[PDB]
């Protein structure tokens, strides 16, 4: 029974549960990697070794946080649990293919941990640029194991994207138009379209890197007429959409949490929010070379990529202002989920604005490959994607489990994490402006105070992560069973109880025209 249920699943809820467990484990790995980074940088000098061991840690940190923590939790976990329930569907379109999306991730993760155990690891950065990632400067199995890790995670998400798009298009009640689906459902459909189009281009690029490393191709090798900058275009053609993939489902969860804890039946400006997410998804395909402003491209190309990148602020601004307009006039409940969501609105805005600074090619000459970039992306990932995950987790844990968290503990957890992430990343702006490069194991003495403070911040964030594990334990240990949930009239996912039965919507909803 246990094998049939948990290894042979065709159930959207159990598969969502598997994704959340996987993502939680991955988050502990990514946290450990982040503390090794900050331990190395927490005093001047060398702690671990030279830049190779250091950049193996940095590279693994990024892959684990992106591919094994954020994507599995947002898309595999919240997407599988909530999407079918929010459209009254009985499961996903391809419930057996859904299970293979999940089971590809343990092997993907095994190949990444194998990369780090064999030879000297893949000390390449998560971008895996040649020729450093090539067979001369990274001889041996490490980079190939990283490529194969990415291939399996790629297939997982491509099949997952086919599943979500089909489910969301084909399995709504027949009276429900696409303009009557919840914002979280829109956020997952748009994310799935980005994955479907972007991951195959990554697959092509890392396959070329694989053949340059093993079959004597020369896509990226000037000796054969290749070009290292071609790899960068193919990678970033995927990589910019990838960051929109990382935040879009977070946008969707934020819309639900703000609406819910404002005591509103609906988000402000629903069609604006749909427009904004589709605009961000589209613009996210035409900006990739803002990752390449120092490679030597032509001035008019730099002018185009600057302008196109800045345009993203307009639809993103409509969402931020629409969240504020949802709070406006609310009966505000100061739940732990609301605290995560309010931290999201503010800290995501700050990281979005440092992204607009970086969009300026002329200024990016001096900010590129500095901690200013590191500050920008940790505001949007470690205070944006992560705050949306934590908000969604504390909001929907009682739906998934049938048990309540201790709200006081959850507020403590929020407060500690808020202090730690800001102490970690705010000073990295100063390190960036003043010229500290990325992917350094050690720094000139002038950079010591801000690196010291940043590392102290990382330890506060570790305390929050440890407390979170205790808080989940306390909920399962105490077994406070959910009774009533407010606002079920505009939150269908709650209307089958906590937890919902294994089979929901065996009899579909009645919706007339």
């Amino acid at each position: 029974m246990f094998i049939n249920r948990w290894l042979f699943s065709t159930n959207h809820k159990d598969i969502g549960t598997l994704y959340l467990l996987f993502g939680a484990w991955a988050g502990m790995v990514g946290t450990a990697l982040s503390l090794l980074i900050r331990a190395e940088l927490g005093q001047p000098g060398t702690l671990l070794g030279d830049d190779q061991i250091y950049n193996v840690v940095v590279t693994a940190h990024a892959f684990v946080m992106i591919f094994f923590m954020v994507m599995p939790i947002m898309i595999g976990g919240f997407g599988n649990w909530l999407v079918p329930l929010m459209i009254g569907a009985p499961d996903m379109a391809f419930p057996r293919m859904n299970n293979m999306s999940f089971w590809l991730l343990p092997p993907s993760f095994l190949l990444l941990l194998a990369s780090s155990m064999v030879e000297a690891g893949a000390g390449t950065g998560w971008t895996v640029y040649p020729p450093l990632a090539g067979n001369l400067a990274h001889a041996g199995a490490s980079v190939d194991l990283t490529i194969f890790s990415l291939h399996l995670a790629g297939v997982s998400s491509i099949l997952g994207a086919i599943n979500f798009i089909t489910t969301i298009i084909n399995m709504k009640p027949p009276a429900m138009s696409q303009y009557q689906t919840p914002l979280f459902v829109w956020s997952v459909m748009i994310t799935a379209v980005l994955l479907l189009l972007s991951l195959p281009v990554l697959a092509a690029g890392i396959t070329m890197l694989l053949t340059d490393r093993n079959l004597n191709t020369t896509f990226f090798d000037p000796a054969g007429g290749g070009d290292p900058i071609l790899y960068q275009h193919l990678f970033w053609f995927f990589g910019h959409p990838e960051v929109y993939i990382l935040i879009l489902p977070g946008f969707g969860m934020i819309s639900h949490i703000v609406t819910y804890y404002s005591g509103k039946k609906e988000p402000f400006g629903y069609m604006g929010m749909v427009w904004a997410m589709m605009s961000i998804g589209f613009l996210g395909f035409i900006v990739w070379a803002h990752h390449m402003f120092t490679v030597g491209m032509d001035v008019d190309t730099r002018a185009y990529f600057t302008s196109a990148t800045m345009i993203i602020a307009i639809p993103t601004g409509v969402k931020v202002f629409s969240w504020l307009a949802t709070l406006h006039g609310g009966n505000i409940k100061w739940s732990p989920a609301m605290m995560w969501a309010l931290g999201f609105i503010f800290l995501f805005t700050v990281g979005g604005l440092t992204g607009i600074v970086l969009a300026n090619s002329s200024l990016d000459i001096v900010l590129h490959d500095t901690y200013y970039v590191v500050a920008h992306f940790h505001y949007v990932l470690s205070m944006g994607a992560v705050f949306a995950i934590m908000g969604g987790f504390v909001h929907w844990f009682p739906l998934f489990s049938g048990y309540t968290l201790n709200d006081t503990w959850a507020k403590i957890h929020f407060a500690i994490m808020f202090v730690g992430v800001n102490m970690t990343f705010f000073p990295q702006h100063f390190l960036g402006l003043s010229g500290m490069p990325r992917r350094y194991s050690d720094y000139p003495d002038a950079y010591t105070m801000w690196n010291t403070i940043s590392s102290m911040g990382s330890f506060i964030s570790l305390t929050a992560v440890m407390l979170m594990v205790f808080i989940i334990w306390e909920a399962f240990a105490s077994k406070r069973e959910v009774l009533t949930v407010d606002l079920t009239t505009t939150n269908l996912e709650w209307l089958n109880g906590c937890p919902p039965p294994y089979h929901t919507f065996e009899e579909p909803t009645y919706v007339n025209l």
Partner: protein, 258 residues
């Protein structure tokens, strides 16, 4: 249930498929670096066993058990369209690599395309024959489709057999051209782009020919009705995708790149 959707029996094939992916990737690693094919051959075997049993079960669920309502069929239509789009974007990466290298040939090449010391195939010889063969197969598969819709078993089988024969002809012609080519995959970016792009295309032709052969045996076994035959539609869509990728390769690599 009072909806039309398919609740799938708990299945081991997702796990066997995931593990076949681990064995194929770890197997390629073991082949490239540790001089051994063992893991790779286990992974290819388990991958083929998984595909066989999974698609067998899809036939059981549809032809034999009746789970493919119109709503289910519509979902499979979208799934196959989306899968084809993802394959289009995969090939787009290789076309980008090709145009990148060929539009700005570096000094190492002699600053020209084709590179110094590269003698391209004549696009009017076997490459043109291959074009005629795949376009012809696009016509015969359309004949097969209309035969099936009109309820004509014999003509469906003859048209589908002709379509498979042309797919096999293309594969044998390409194998012979690979053997005869005076350039290799190691002849710089010209060989790299030529063999990786045409090689992935060749693999898709083999996959598509295999799918058409599956439809051929299912047709022999009377699985398809005149109105319900999604496996045939999906194989036909895939087969048109393979034709169209060939036309782009022919124009880009063989003709414009010569």
């Amino acid at each position: 249930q009072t909806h039309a959707y398919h609740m799938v029996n708990p299945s081991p094939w997702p796990l066997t498929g995931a593990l076949s992916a681990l064995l194929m990737t770890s197997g390629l690693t073991m082949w490239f670096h540790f001089n051994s094919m063992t893991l790779l051959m286990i992974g290819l075997t388990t991958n083929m066993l998984t595909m066989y049993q999974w698609w067998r079960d899809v036939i059981r669920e549809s032809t034999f058990q009746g789970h493919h309502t119109p709503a289910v069929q519509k979902g499979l239509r979208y799934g196959m369209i989306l899968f084809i789009i993802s394959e289009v974007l995969f090939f787009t990466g290789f076309f980008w690599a090709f145009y990148h290298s060929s539009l700005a040939p570096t000094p190492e090449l002699g600053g020209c395309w084709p590179p110094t010391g590269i003698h391209p195939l004549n696009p009017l010889e076997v490459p043109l024959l291959n074009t005629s063969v795949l376009l012809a197969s696009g016509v015969s598969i359309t004949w097969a489709h209309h035969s099936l819709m009109e309820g004509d078993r014999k003509h469906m089988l003859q048209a589908l057999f002709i379509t498979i024969t042309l797919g096999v002809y293309f594969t044998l012609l390409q194998a012979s051209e690979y053997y005869e080519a005076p350039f290799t995959i190691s002849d710089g970016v010209y060989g790299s782009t030529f063999f990786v792009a045409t090689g992935f295309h060749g693999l898709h032709v083999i996959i598509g020919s295999t799918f058409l052969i599956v439809c051929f045996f299912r047709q022999l076994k009377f699985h398809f009705t005149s109105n319900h035959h999604f496996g045939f539609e999906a194989a036909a869509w895939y087969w048109h995708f393979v034709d169209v990728v060939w036309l782009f390769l022919y124009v880009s690599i063989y003709w414009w790149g010569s």
